[PDB]
Structure 1
Amino acid sequence: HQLSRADVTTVSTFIDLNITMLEDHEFVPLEVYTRHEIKDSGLLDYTE
């Protein structure tokens, strides 16, 4: 009789190697203090 290849158990001669891509990353703007904060840290503003 004939039979499908799926009827025969499969052994692999291939060596596996799983490489995955480094995914995209988004860098948002990020400051510890803005210019507004730096200017506001003064106690008196001469101009105002």
Structure 2
Amino acid sequence: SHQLSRADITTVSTFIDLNITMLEDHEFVPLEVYTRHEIKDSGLLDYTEV
């Protein structure tokens, strides 16, 4: 009768699907609540400067 391409016939899936995605790379920046200079400046008087 004739030849047929593979795509010509509908296919049912005999595979079970399992989807895994990787963990994304992340970057941690330097973050502080108070720096050294701010903590030093918190004092009302500094003996050295005075």
TM-score (norm 2): 0.91
TM superposition shift of 1:33: 0.3
Unpaired runs of 5+ in structure 1? none
Query: Aligned-residue CA RMSD in angstroms?
Result: 0.5
CA deviations on 1:8-45 (whole Å, 9 max, x unpaired) are: 10111101011000010000000000000100100101
Runs of 4+ in 1 over 4 A off after TM superposition: none
Counterpart of 2:14 in structure 1 is: 13
Counterpart of 2:43 in structure 1 is: 42
Number of aligned pairs?
A: 48
TM-score (norm 1): 0.95
